[PDB]
Structures are given as C-alpha cells and as structure tokens.
Write a protein that binds this ligand. Structure first.
Ligand SMILES: [Mg+2]
Ligand SMILES: [Mg+2]
Ligand SMILES: [Mg+2]
Ligand SMILES: [Mg+2]
Ligand SMILES: [Mg+2]
Ligand SMILES: [Mg+2]
Ligand SMILES: [Mg+2]
Ligand SMILES: [Mg+2]
Ligand SMILES: [Mg+2]
Ligand SMILES: [Mg+2]
Ligand SMILES: [Mg+2]
Ligand SMILES: [Mg+2]
Ligand SMILES: [Mg+2]
Ligand SMILES: [Mg+2]
Ligand SMILES: [Mg+2]
Lengths: 118, 172, 131, 60
RNA sequence: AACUGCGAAUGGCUCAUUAAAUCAGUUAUGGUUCCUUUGGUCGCUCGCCACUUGGAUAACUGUGGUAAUUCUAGA
RNA sequence: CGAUCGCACGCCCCCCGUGGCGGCGACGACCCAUUCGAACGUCUGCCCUAUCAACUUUCGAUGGUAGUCGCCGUGCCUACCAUGGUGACCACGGGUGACGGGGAAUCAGGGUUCGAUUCCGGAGAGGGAGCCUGAGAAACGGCUACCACAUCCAAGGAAGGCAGCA
RNA sequence: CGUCGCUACUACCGAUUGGAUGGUUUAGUGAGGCCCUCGGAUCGGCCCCGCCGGGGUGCCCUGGCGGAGCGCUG
RNA sequence: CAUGGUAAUCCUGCUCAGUACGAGAGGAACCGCAGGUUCAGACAUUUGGUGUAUGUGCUUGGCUGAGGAGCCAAUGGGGCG
C-alpha cells in the first residue's frame, strides 16, 4: 500500500493516475499528468515553475522534544542497592571517626618507622 | 558446522567415524535422500533446501537430475546420550562423523558404485515401494554382499502410495 | 507460479533496439517474435519480457551475420502494470540470449522490467537493478 | 519476526518472537529512537512505552 | 584480550611505459618540506579541582540477525 | 606554555610531626639545528627515420603583469597586454624487438655489438581514473568508481588482483 | 636469345566504404571522488525554576524528582 | 414469437508428474488452476491521441498616437488543455 509523490510537482498521486519513469542510470520517477512530465523532459527547474510545491517551500508561501533520562540505580557485584546505600550514608559524623583513626594509624606507623631507623 | 582442522580430533578418534555409500536404482531419490542428510547436519555444510544439493558436483547432473559421478562429503552431528547408550558397538564421545559417498546406481553400472563400496564399510540400499525391488538394486547389493559391506535398507517414496495410489495401511 | 500478463506491445518487428549487456553487441534489429500466431498484415511486435529474435547491426564483427534468440527488457512505449501505474523507460533495450534463456553475457547495464525479471530468473539474477 | 527487548536500567534483556500483524501496525512505519506505544501486546504490556533502538534486516 | 603508539610508503618481482624524458656526471634551492635519530629550548608572558577536572569507550557480560565475509547491531 | 608513567628512595624540621625539599629515568612537546632524505631546478650527453621540413600558438604556445593553488622557484592555472618560441648545427613527426647507467662479449690499436637480470636511479603492481590516514602513498599482500576478466550464492548479496615465495 | 607450353614458390594490384589492432584527438554523455553552499535524522549542555527545598539565614546552600527554558548554544 | 440471421477459436505455463510406460535415455494424458492468440460486442475511470472550447499563457511581423486593450497574416506560429 503505497501512495507515491510526483517527482516534479511533488503531489500525492493516487493509484488511478499518473505514470512512471525509469532511467537507464537506474533512477525512477513519477509524474502526475502530462504537464508535469513534459516539464521534466524539458529539464525545467520546478523551483522556478510557480505552483510546484517545492517552489512555494523555497519562497515560503505556506508554513523537537528532547526529553532526558538520567538514571543510576544498578547494583554492583559484591554488594546491592541496600549495601551501596548503607556505605554511602555514614555522613552524620561517622566518617570522621574512621578518618581520624586512619590518620592516627598513619601517624603511629611513621613514629614506628622513626624508631626503626633511629 | 565447525572449522576445517577439527576433523582431526574425531577423524583419528577410532571407532567413531562412519563410512557410508548410498546405492539404489536410477532416479530413486539418492540425490534427494542425501540432500535431506546434508541439509540439517554439516561439519561445515549449510542447510540448503533447494531440491538438488551437494550430492551432484558436476554440470548436466542438476539439469537432468541423473547421477553420473560418485561424490563424497564429510558431515558432522551431535548425538544425545540416550543414543550414546543405544549404540551397542564401541562408542567414544558424542561427536559422530560421517564419510558419505552418493554413488550412481545406473544400469550402465558406472563402476563408481564399486569404487564407493571399496572405500566404504556400510551401504545404504534405497528401494522404492511402488516400484518394488528394482533390478539395479539387486545388482548393487550383489556386489555389496560379495565385498562384505554391511547393508541397511532405506525404502523410499511412500508419498506415491499415500497420495498417488491412496493405498491402505495394511496394504502398505 | 503464474504466467505473465498482457502488456502494450509498442515494439514492432522493424524496430532497432540496443543491447544492455557485456557481450559487446550494441544494436539489435528484431527479426520476429517467438510464439506469435500472426494475422493478416499485422506485423508481430515485442514487449518487455518477450522471447524474440534479432540481428546485431553495430557491434563485434564475428557476431553480426547471425540470427540469435533475444529477450526484451526495456521499452519507451508505456503499459499499465495491472495496478494502475504506467511505466516506460528511456529506450527499448534487450539482451541477447541462447535458446533456453541463459543470457550469454555476464552483466546487464541499466534497469530491467520486473515482468521480464520474474519471467526469466537467470537475467533477473544478473540484472543490475529491478524496476 | 523476533523482538529483542531490553531494560538498560535493569538488564534482563531477552528475545521474543511475534507474529501479530495488528500488533506490528503500532510500530510499523516509525522512525528509530521513537517513543512508541507497545501497549497493544496482550493485556499486560500496559503502561509500557518503548523506544526503537534499531533492528536487523532479513538479510542480516 | 582490548584500547593506545609505531611500522606496514621497507623489502621482493618485472621492465609494460618511457627517445634530452629516465639516467650519468655536474651544480643550486640565498625558491622548499622533512615523522624518526642527535643536540638545542621548554617558570622569559604578571594573567571555589591543581594534592589531578569532564565525558565517552572498547575489551568484558547478555540478547540476536544474515546462505555467506576479518559483516555486524541492540542492552 | 607538560593534568602522564616507571625505578631507587631519601633529606629539613624551628613553625614541629605533616608538610617542606631532592635522585634515577621513561614518555613528552611549539620551534631551531642536525641526520634520513625527497622534490623541482643548471650545463652537457641518446638508437634509427626526411617514401617525416616546417612545426607550436582557438584548446598556453612564447613572455611581461596581478593574482589562485602548491611546501616552495617557476601560464601550475586564472585575468589583461606582447606575438611570440624551435628548426638543415635536423626542429617537428614516426619507429624502436628502447627502462638508463655502472658494466658484458670481442680484443694490435681503432672499434663493433650486448647490457630485461641481483648495484644505483626511474616506472608498474590487470587497463584507466579519484581518494582517506599517514612525516612520507596518488599506496595497491589500503579504499572508491568504471572497463575487462573472474569466485560463491537459499538468487536476497558478498568477495577478487601472484610484473611477491613457491 | 626471346615468345609461347608445364609445375611450385614468392611477393604486388584488387571491388569488398575489407576487417582487426592501439594510440592520439573533436563533439556529446558522464560513474565516482574531492571541494563549495546548503541541509538537518539524531546526540549534548545552559536555560533547571512546578517543587518538594530551604541557608549564609518568604530573601534557597540545596538532597533528588518532575515539567520544560517550548528559548539559548553546541 | 412465425420467421431470418447467429460466435466463438486456438495455444501456452503450473498441477497432475518427472508419474504412467520404458533397461536406460527418455517421457505424456484426464480433473483442476492461471494466462495468452484470433475474432466479436461495448466503453473513456485511467494512459495516449485529437484539439479552433480559437480555453489560457508565450512569441514573429504589421496595425489601431502610446500604456492598457486588441486585431490581421485563408488555423500567424508555438506550450499546455
Ligand atoms: Mg500484404
Ligand atoms: Mg621493455
Ligand atoms: Mg597515568
Ligand atoms: Mg636489457
Ligand atoms: Mg636496481
Ligand atoms: Mg607516520
Ligand atoms: Mg603505487
Ligand atoms: Mg595506484
Ligand atoms: Mg431460428
Ligand atoms: Mg493556443
Ligand atoms: Mg507582433
Ligand atoms: Mg493608449
Ligand atoms: Mg499593448
Ligand atoms: Mg486590413
Ligand atoms: Mg497536445
């Protein structure tokens, strides 16, 4: 079920009208009536003939939705949505204890190294 | 449908290869039966379904559907374990391999049938129902017994009995 | 399957058509049409996908002075395709074939008529583009 | 006619075959990357709008 | 395994083409390009991440298609 | 106008004590020079042919001039003016069973023939033509089109280039 | 010594607009590439701005959601 | 309706069936299906043709003082209809 469009006049051709043109190069064309195909065989520019639709489109005689998707919910091997949530939300003054503990441990090791060398 | 050099692994795996030669009277579906064989299966073979196939490796064979020169094909197949205990003889693995030679059984007695028999261990004798046992089938099994080839009967063309003759099952 | 449909003939016996193949023959002078019963003073004509015969006029010399079977693949006389579309091409073109239908060249230049294509599978396989 | 469905958010993408032409009308003659309503399939594809990531011709 | 970097413009073969053309010697580019090697230069400018910023992406997992390719897609 | 990567690791501590400072590299780079070169150029030099003596100049031929492009010099090409340039010192045209040279054969001397071929330069990768990347290709065991061959094909397409070793 | 007589060879002329082979070109068509002007299937961000929100303190830090700024840039 | 005229014809392809038959090579038929040739009888939706609707543009020469509007040139030509 195909409604063609005229290769010159740019018109919806209904099944009962028009003809086809097949070119030795391989190109195919469709014309509405004798007038259109005579113009085409005359090599006339349709954007010059005053009623070809593409002419009006050129001359402006007549007359988008980028919807975003920001998602991150996947779990990660060795953990899950719960586990990642739990280890992401120790914000209420729980990180600091681990923070200072690691810093002091690093400080204690460097004093241990100071002892070993001297 | 595997690569070219894995024929080694099964082909040296003794007691697993099977060598057949199909023998029948003329036009008895040797080509058709072997094409049915090659379609589904294949060690590299595809699933061609257009009547004649790799059985006839020569012109003026497909243009008269008459077999002239015997052709060999390598084929593969994977077997389900139920058959792997079905197999009474020595069985080694699931990847069973076939060396099949489709050979013309014409009344000229193109010695290709004999060549295939010599290079094979088993024979797939194909005999039609409505045509009965043909003379050339008797000929080909006559050299099969002489050369000590294991024969196996593959009777064909019952669609003629069903639709053409509209025969009764007991008469079948 | 199904046999072809009658089409506008528009290609009489006296016509001169070109070869769309690689056999090197250029011209084709229709000689008769295969399968035409005939009539009084009605010179038989060809259409796309008709087994006809023609002589080559311009082309390779060894190929000239002979009568060869041919099939017609192009024409500039229109004909309805039973669906209300009328199709015609620039020129009337055909390709030299053997008796059975195997076109004796190996390539076809330009498009082919779909009726000719499914009437002759060999040329359809070789046909550049279908139309 | 094989339909490859995918949840990029959840994975679990699988393949299903279909034949309902009336079903296929709904996504026939559509552009790619087009949000189309596939709710026609069964009574349980409701509330599912889908995007056309592409497809593969009969000749692969 | 993949991404990345380099090489793939070497070499091998043949002499069809080519008659001041190639080529031989000579001499110029102060009228030009030159990855690489090597030696130079790399704080010369005043002008809310720098204790390091963003995004994709193969390989990899899963779902396919094609008679068919060092064809590939979608997630 | 380094948001890089290894291999040793170490040093100053007043303010301290956690920061501050240094080694060996590698990978880098705008550009300069050098190297490998490449390209176009100077002068001279080539077999036979006059039953090839006048060519070239519309369609660049010979220049000037301003330009385009090219990496640059240069009708490379364009726009305007000049009618020019070569030729019996063989121009031009035709053949060449012509890739050139180093050299090979012959050897009183003189010369005569042969150099497709391992070295050098040039060209080609079936015949044309156009390209991408790349410093370097008009590349072809790179791509694209045509022609000519030519493989498989469920006929819907896909893939070719042994003047490389065999 | 010639003509004439016999036989083979060899070229030469020859209607056939002989035919073929390449190259050079004239006019015409012209695939393909590159360049140019466009063109915009898609893919981004700013504008988020209805907000739940709120903080230096309804004058938001914003935690994410949601329309969409129906613009502004790639 | 007495009467008189009278019209249909042939060939393909599929299937039958690669079957009957035949050693093989070869190789039909009937039912059915899809067409096609010749002839006949109509008809213009479509496609083409015709075109002086002298319908509408374009245009040669001349003519109405020019613009507009037109006309003549035995259908002025020509494009479309
Ligand atoms: Mg007569
Ligand atoms: Mg040579
Ligand atoms: Mg790093
Ligand atoms: Mg030589
Ligand atoms: Mg050399
Ligand atoms: Mg490079
Ligand atoms: Mg090259
Ligand atoms: Mg090249
Ligand atoms: Mg009567
Ligand atoms: Mg008129
Ligand atoms: Mg006038
Ligand atoms: Mg007036
Ligand atoms: Mg007037
Ligand atoms: Mg008058
Ligand atoms: Mg008309």
């Amino acid at each position: 079920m195909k409604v063609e469009l005229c290769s010159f006049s740019g018109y919806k051709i209904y099944p009962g009208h028009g003809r086809r043109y097949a070119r030795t190069d391989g190109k195919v064309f469709q014309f509405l009536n004798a007038k259109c195909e005579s113009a085409f065989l005359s090599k006339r520019n349709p954007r010059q003939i005053n009623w070809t639709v593409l002419y009006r489109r050129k001359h402006k005689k007549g007359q988008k939705r980028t919807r975003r998707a920001v998602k991150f919910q996947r779990a990660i091997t060795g953990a899950s949505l719960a586990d990642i949530m739990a280890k992401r939300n120790q914000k209420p003054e729980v990180r600091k204890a681990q923070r200072e503990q690691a810093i002091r441990a690093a400080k204690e090791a460097k004093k241990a190294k100071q002892a070993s060398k001297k | 449908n595997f690569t070219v050099d894995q024929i080694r692994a099964i082909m040296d795996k003794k007691a697993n290869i099977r060598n057949m030669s199909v023998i029948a009277h003329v036009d008895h579906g040797k080509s058709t039966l072997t094409d049915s064989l090659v379609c589904k299966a294949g060690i590299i073979a595809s699933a061609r379904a257009g009547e004649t196939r790799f059985t006839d490796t020569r012109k003026d064979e497909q243009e008269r559907c008459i077999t002239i020169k015997s052709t060999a094909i390598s084929l593969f197949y994977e077997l389900s374990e139920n058959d792997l205990n079905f197999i009474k003889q020595s069985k080694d693995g699931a990847g069973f391999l076939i060396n099949l030679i489709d050979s013309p059984g014409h009344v000229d007695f193109s010695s290709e049938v004999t060549a295939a028999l010599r290079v094979t261990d088993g024979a797939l004798v194909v005999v039609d129902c409505v045509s009965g046992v043909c003379v050339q089938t008797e000929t080909v099994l006559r050299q099969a017994i002489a050369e000590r080839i294991k024969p196996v009967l593959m009777m064909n063309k019952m669609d003629r009995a069903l639709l053409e003759l509209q025969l009764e099952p007991e008469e079948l | 399957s199904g046999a072809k449909f009658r089409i506008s003939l528009g290609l009489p016996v006296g016509a001169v058509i070109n070869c769309a193949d690689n056999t090197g023959a250029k011209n084709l002078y229709i000689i008769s049409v295969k399968g035409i019963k005939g009539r009084l003073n009605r010179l038989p004509a060809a259409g796309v996908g008709d087994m006809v015969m023609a002589t080559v006029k311009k082309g390779k010399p060894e190929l000239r002075k002979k009568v060869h079977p041919a099939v017609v693949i192009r024409q500039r006389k229109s004909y309805r395709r039973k669906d209300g579309v009328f199709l015609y091409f620039e020129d009337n073109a055909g390709v030299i074939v053997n008796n059975k239908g195997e076109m004796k060249g190996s390539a076809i230049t330009g498009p082919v008529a779909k009726e000719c294509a499914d009437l002759w599978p060999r040329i359809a396989s070789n046909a550049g583009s279908i139309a | 006619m094989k339909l490859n469905i995918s949840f990029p958010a959840t994975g679990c993408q699988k393949l299903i075959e279909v034949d309902d032409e009336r079903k296929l009308r709904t996504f026939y003659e559509k552009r790619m990357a087009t949000e189309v309503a596939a709710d026609a399939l069964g009574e349980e594809w409701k509330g599912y709008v889908v995007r056309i990531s592409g497809g593969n011709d009969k000749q692969g």
